[PDB]
Ligand binder design. Structure first.
Ligand SMILES: [Cl-]
Ligand SMILES: [Cl-]
Ligand SMILES: [Cl-]
Ligand code: NA
Ligand code: NA
Ligand code: NA
Lengths: 35, 74
């Protein structure tokens, strides 16, 4: 770990990945299949 | 078909935009967002929602991650 390491910023990656919008739709589709 | 559903493949592409050590935290955030936006309250649906999210790295070839650990559901 150092000042110039990769230093991932998870919230920024989340917004850059469209808030995982396709995963959100997939999760929703699976959830309503319960039982 | 042996290929996965297109929507699942789109999800995997989005997950690949993140570092492995961010995936589980962001999937928890995604699950909470869907749960709240869609007003999912039936117990079995809520459990399946969060379980599906925790298994996505293993549904998506993220070998370093595996299945995300269980965290109590809000
Ligand atoms: Cl985040
Ligand atoms: Cl959604
Ligand atoms: Cl994949
Ligand atoms: Na399925
Ligand atoms: Na959010
Ligand atoms: Na219930």
């Amino acid at each position: 770990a150092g000042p110039f390491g990769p230093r991932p910023s998870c919230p920024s990656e989340f917004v850059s990945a469209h808030r995982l919008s396709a995963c959100e739709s997939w999760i929703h589709s699976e959830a309503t299949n319960a039982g | 078909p042996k290929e996965r559903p297109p929507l699942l493949r789109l999800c995997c592409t989005e997950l690949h935009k993140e570092n492995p050590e961010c995936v589980c935290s962001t999937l928890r955030r995604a699950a909470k967002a869907t749960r709240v936006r869609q007003g999912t309250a039936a117990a079995s649906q809520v459990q399946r929602l969060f379980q599906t999210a925790r298994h996505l790295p293993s549904t998506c070839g993220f070998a370093g991650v595996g299945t995300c650990p269980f965290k109590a559901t809000p």
